[PDB]
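Q: what does this look like with sodium ion bound?
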Amino acid sequence: AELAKPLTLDQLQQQNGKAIDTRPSAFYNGWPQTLNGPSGHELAALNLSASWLDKMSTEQLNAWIKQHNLKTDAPVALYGNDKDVDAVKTRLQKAGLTHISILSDALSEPSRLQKLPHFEQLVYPQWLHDLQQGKEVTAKPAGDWKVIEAAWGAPKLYLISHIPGADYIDTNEVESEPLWNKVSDEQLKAMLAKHGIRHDTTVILYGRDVYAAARVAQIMLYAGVKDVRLLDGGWQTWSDAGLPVERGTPPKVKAEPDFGVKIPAQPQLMLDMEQARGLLHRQDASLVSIRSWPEFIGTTSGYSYIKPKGEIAGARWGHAGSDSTHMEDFHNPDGTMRSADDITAMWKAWNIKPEQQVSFYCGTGWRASETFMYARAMGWKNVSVYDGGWYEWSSDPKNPVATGERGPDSSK
Amino acid sequence: SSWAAELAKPLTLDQLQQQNGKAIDTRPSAFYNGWPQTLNGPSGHELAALNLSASWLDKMSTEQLNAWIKQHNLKTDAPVALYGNDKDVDAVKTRLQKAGLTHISILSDALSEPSRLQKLPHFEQLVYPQWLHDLQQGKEVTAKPAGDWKVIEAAWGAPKLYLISHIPGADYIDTNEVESEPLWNKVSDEQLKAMLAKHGIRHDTTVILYGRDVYAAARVAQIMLYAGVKDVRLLDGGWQTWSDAGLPVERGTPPKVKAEPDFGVKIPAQPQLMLDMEQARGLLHRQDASLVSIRSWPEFIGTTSGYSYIKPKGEIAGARWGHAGSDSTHMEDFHNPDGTMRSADDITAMWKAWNIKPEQQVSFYCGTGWRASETFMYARAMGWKNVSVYDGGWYEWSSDPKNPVATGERGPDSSK
Ligand code: NA
Ligand code: NA
């Protein structure tokens, strides 16, 4: 049961061990725990939040151990809040790790920490609550800000409960028939004015599902809202935190008829079909499929209304989830974004790399929007979404299609 | 219900793991162990997958399948997900249903992510027939020998069955060429030097051994490794697998071999792969070392010596049981129904329950070293870094009545 000898970061390194940060990911990502506090995690630290443990079965934990290459007898040094450290210690002990210490000097040198380059784009609930209350917070919006729930269709679960002061966006306001591509620049301008968004309004989006808010978020970035943020993990994190809620219909919003710049200010953030096709078979560019494996291999289209099966020939698999409405490969057990290191490694194995021009697509753009926001938070400088995705590509039977089981080599 | 016909829904590995289910790899063990099905393709199995090859099924009775199911603790109702080719998955699915498993799915994303696969760290040391045939015929193969290579059949005595048939281009080595009376220990370094030269083997010749019995070839292989042949391999499951694959064969006496008088390194280049009695005794009563008995349970408890010409009964005191087989000449505990090496995960668990672990200095012995060489070759392929054979085994140990002897039913605690 007892911990082994405490180790400094230097000693752990000399012993080829690994540091495990037991704090929630928000903090691992770069959010300081208190104002002006240390930002980020120790060099090469893994993230295993004590708060995830009740949603990790024995086999999930075993898989996480293997996937992070924890050798059975190599030292692991835990840090963070003392209850969390103890809870993680116990699980790792049951999982059969044999040399568990605390990292004694964890977080003591702010200048050697690593962070998500734009962690401030993935907010967490306590921070949003403190912002609302007028408490001084890290990376405060520069001016006006708005919080907005996004979902498909008329307000429904929002009427039962929502984040206080939250406006509501029906996804149908930003996308439509016949392709489920974004609506016109003109329609986006009307939409932005109506919800009182100017180019310098910070917009904080959340949803029951992260991908609905990400979809709206990426479109607003395209249109020209400079500061657009997501609630990491979506509404569930706010619910689980037991923060206050409001109910009923969205309150009247004051229109902002002058956006302040020409829409679209960032047109390069969205590719069309020919542009997407132009990325294929290149070392310096990647067209990334954010589709489930059965979609990628052609077992299923993933969608009721899409008849053709298969994938974009030359698309590099970026992973996704179990079907077209889930994103498990990008999520911690609490629904927040997996560690940037992990996402980076998963993408690298498929030759998808930050120096490339990278464009994500899926069935119609939702899952791709989610990975786009993460890539942006990760500091990836040339990312975009190919809106039309498989629905568009496969509408033309001349377009090259791949099917069957294959690996990274097959998308050179 | 018993007429029920819906397919259990496919599961991702993430899903199987959420539910603490079991994956079952229906491929032949060579691919389970890590051999890729295509040059540069995925290598190995999904984490903690079991191996139940479709090709074993016609050699597994109802009782054997039931014992296998129970040994791997497949709960009647817990999710089981299969993968492999369609014909194999279906054959295995049908047998598992007839044994009464009820929640049987396909693992829909099996092998889709090479980096999470598990394999023998040196799967290439345990070759399989199609690989060798392809090598012979100038095809591209995984883990190709670096330079010259030789295939060699090993068996006790002069060429018998070898004259009826053998692998094409196989030479033949009588085990009497590597070991002899009075102890049945390896012959001297000088005689090994002559043995190697006469068989055309230099330190950088890849040697591929097989026998009608795996342990004959393992015996010769481990001695060659000790001498300093760097790349030594076994045909997994021995001659029988080549015969069952229906591959071409050759007949008659062993062709002449070009002598190779210069070995190229001092023999022995790896002396630490063989222990003497004193070195073996030095492993006893340790947490960081094990002296491992690869003998049948009746040998281990003193019911029988296991041998005609060995009178004392019992076991080296403090030795740890590493399993073996039903009697002194079989190895069921290390074999699949096709004769190939049983799963590394199972062998690892079986050793661990007797406090035999990869972190230890580990030395295997038996009566005279044959079975021990077999397990040595497996632990080597499993990537165990400090393993050896204690050549003299029970025959040498018990020849001196002063050496302490253990007897009777006992567990791992009696070997601390
Ligand atoms: Na679209
Ligand atoms: Na011997």
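Chain B touches chain A through 26 residues (CB under 8 Å). The pocket of sodium ion (ligand 1) is lined by residues A 179-181, 364-365, 387-389 (CB under 6 Å).
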